[PDB]
Amino acid sequence: GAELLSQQWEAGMSLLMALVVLLIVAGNVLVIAAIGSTQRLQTLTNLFITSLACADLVVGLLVVPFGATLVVRGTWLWGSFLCELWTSLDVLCVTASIETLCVIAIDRYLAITSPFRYQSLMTRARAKVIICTVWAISALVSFLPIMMHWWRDEDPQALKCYQDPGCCDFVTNRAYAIASSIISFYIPLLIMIFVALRVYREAKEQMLMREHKALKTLGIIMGVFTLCWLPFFLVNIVNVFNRDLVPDWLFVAFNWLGYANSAMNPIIYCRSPDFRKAFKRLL
Numbered sequence: 001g002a003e004l005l006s007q008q009w010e011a012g013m014s015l016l017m018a019l020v021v022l023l024i025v026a027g028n029v030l031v032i033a034a035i036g037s038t039q040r041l042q043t044l045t046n047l048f049i050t051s052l053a054c055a056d057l058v059v060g061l062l063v064v065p066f067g068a069t070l071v072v073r074g075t076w077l078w079g080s081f082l083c084e085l086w087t088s089l090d091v092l093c094v095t096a097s098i099e100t101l102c103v104i105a106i107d108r109y110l111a112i113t114s115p116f117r118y119q120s121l122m123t124r125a126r127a128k129v130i131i132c133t134v135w136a137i138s139a140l141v142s143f144l145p146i147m148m149h150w151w152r153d154e155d156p157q158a159l160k161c162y163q164d165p166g167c168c169d170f171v172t173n174r175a176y177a178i179a180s181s182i183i184s185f186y187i188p189l190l191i192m193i194f195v196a197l198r199v200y201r202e203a204k205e206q207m208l209m210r211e212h213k214a215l216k217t218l219g220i221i222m223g224v225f226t227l228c229w230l231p232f233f234l235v236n237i238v239n240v241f242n243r244d245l246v247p248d249w250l251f252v253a254f255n256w257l258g259y260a261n262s263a264m265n266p267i268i269y270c271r272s273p274d275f276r277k278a279f280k281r282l283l
């Protein structure tokens, strides 16, 4: 009865989780393989896209599988170390994603307002340093505070969860919830929106239709990212002030909306003929 109902749900979620993993992994391997095998797609801007595919690949290979086992089985099967590692990797990927989008927006702004200054400043070696710096900074604000337990709360509910090896809820204190959100998400979001609007304005004051079509693609990956993660991070803050005003399962839904973003960019890149061709060829 209870057991048949469990077996039905377990089986069904496991397939659905498999699908989501497969979509995230296939899509982002395709983006990486496409850019890595097509001279025409080997632009500096696409180096930044590859970094973003790596973030999403890590979400499909490590973040989502582990979270799937949690949703499907109803406890954490892997112990407390792996629970902390997993949470770290989760925070890392979101931070790395939005910081990279931020860089992309700035890269385009420099390209569009000062194409010559850009041509000579911006090389492959620098693109590389930029990408490493973004991962450095993301690692710094993800791993270290989590491995220093700066996120832990005194509350008994929180304490219940920490001793329990089957609980891997990321139940944090309020200072971390606000700090972490601002540092990992809100600040880079405001930077990206500010620079993205300026790129819009400069594009309006301006082969042109083709360039703009690629800008619009970047604009779409930025907007869909915002739509997918903003709700989660708004709710994160709201909870700090009032635990009860937003229902818990919708806090979970918004988290999964966020994870689902990692499957979206490869689809969105099908707006481009060059990507579409390299995808067909590769498959």
Ligand SMILES: CC(C)CCC[C@@H](C)[C@H]1CC[C@H]2[C@@H]3CC=C4C[C@@H](OC(=O)CCC(=O)O)CC[C@]4(C)[C@H]3CC[C@]12C
Binding pocket: 047, 050, 051, 054, 055, 058, 124, 127, 128, 131, 132, 135
């Ligand atoms: C488990 C967690 C900690 C995974 C962390 C992996 C990172 C170290 C990955 C994610 C994105 C990767 C980057 C994505 C893309 C590139 C472009 C790649 O090729 C080039 O930029 C041109 C170099 C050349 O022409 O040889 C150089 C490595 C680099 C920076 C990668 C270096 C390794 C990065 C930072």
Ligand SMILES: CC(C)CCC[C@@H](C)[C@H]1CC[C@H]2[C@@H]3CC=C4C[C@@H](OC(=O)CCC(=O)O)CC[C@]4(C)[C@H]3CC[C@]12C
Binding pocket: 173, 174, 175, 176, 178, 179, 180, 182, 183, 187
């Ligand atoms: C490192 C750079 C990128 C960040 C620069 C921003 C900081 C100078 C300021 C801006 C907003 C400030 C935050 C605003 C609100 C809070 C909540 C505050 O204290 C509480 O939340 C008490 C609640 C409780 O524990 O009951 C903790 C510090 C923090 C994150 C502040 C820490 C310092 C912040 C991040």
Ligand SMILES: Cc1cc(N2CCNCC2)nc2ccccc12
Binding pocket: 090, 091, 094, 170, 172, 176, 177, 178, 180, 181, 184, 185, 236, 255, 258
């Ligand atoms: C920055 C940040 C991320 C985060 N994720 C864990 C759940 N999966 C989505 C990402 N959770 C946080 C919780 C508190 C503060 C900051 C967080």
Ligand code: NA
Binding pocket: 055, 056, 093, 094, 097, 261, 262
């Ligand atoms: Na992402």
Ligand code: NA
Binding pocket: 080, 161, 162, 163, 164, 165, 166, 167, 168, 169
């Ligand atoms: Na625990």
